[PDB]
């Protein structure tokens, strides 16, 4: 809790298994298999009440998780692949937080 990214605090997830992402292309699949452990397995997010819906929560979660990971060598290909796997984890995280919020 209470994590700071880019000078803003109040960010909050537990580690998740990184799954394989299936890109529909042999080279991308092989590159992902080679590099997937360099990518995050925990996502940064903010409380669900700070968003209107899942899409906006997930947008921040993807953006900030990747920024935190890349500012703390990643190419543009790495960023694009991180966007795919981190989006899935952020969706999972949103469902966890949403269920807790509606209780």
């Amino acid at each position: 809790a209470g994590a700071v990214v880019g000078g803003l605090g109040g960010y909050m997830g537990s580690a998740m298994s990184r799954p394989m992402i299936h890109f529909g292309n042999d080279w991308e699949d092989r590159y992902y298999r080679e590099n997937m452990y360099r990518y995050p397995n925990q996502v940064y997010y903010r409380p669900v009440d700070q968003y209107s819906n899942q899409n906006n929560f997930v947008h921040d979660c993807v953006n900030i998780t990747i920024k935190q990971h890349t500012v703390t060598n990643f190419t543009e290909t790495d960023v694009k692949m991180m966007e795919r796997v981190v989006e899935q984890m952020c969706v999972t995280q949103y469902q966890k937080e949403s269920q807790a919020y509606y209780d």
């Epitope: 990214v5 000078g7 803003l8 109040g10 700070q50 968003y51 906006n56 921040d60 953006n63 900030i64």
Partner: nanobody, 124 residues
Framework: QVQLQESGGGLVQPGGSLRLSCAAS????????MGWFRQAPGKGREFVAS????????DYTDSVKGRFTISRDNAKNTMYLQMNNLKPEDTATYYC?????????????????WGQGTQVTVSS
């Protein structure tokens, strides 16, 4: 020391347009990322659009993309929201706010120094 106050608003017909402004005090408006939020009756403030300090990057909630345009005039210490193709769902109090930290985000917690707000009503 940068504080904010919205102007513009009022009534607009469905499909019409209007422009909101957000005037800033102090000397460093041009160093702040900025955002617009809106609060519909009985709801909390939720993201509409944001713009970086330089004006070079902007972001929008999906339901306003292509209809609303955020902009700023650093020389005049003001940010704008041009609202086109207004829909009944757009009726709300609109607030401007100063960005916290270096990254524009969509969360309500990414901004502070909220203006007092201005009202937009789509006619019915």
């Amino acid at each position: 020391q940068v504080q904010l106050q919205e102007s513009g608003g009022g009534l607009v017909q469905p499909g019409g347009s209007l422009r909101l402004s957000c005037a800033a005090s102090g000397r460093t408006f041009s160093s702040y990322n900025m955002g617009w939020f809106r609060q519909a009756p009985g709801k909390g403030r939720e993201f509409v659009a944001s713009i970086t300090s330089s004006g070079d990057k902007s972001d929008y909630t999906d339901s306003v993309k292509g209809r609303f345009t955020i902009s700023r005039d650093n020389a005049k210490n003001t940010m704008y929201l041009q609202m086109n193709n207004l829909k009944p769902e757009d009726t709300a109090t609109y607030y401007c706010a100063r960005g916290l930290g270096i990254y524009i985000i969509r969360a309500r917690g990414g901004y502070d120094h909220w203006g007092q707000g201005t009202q937009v009503t789509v006619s019915s």
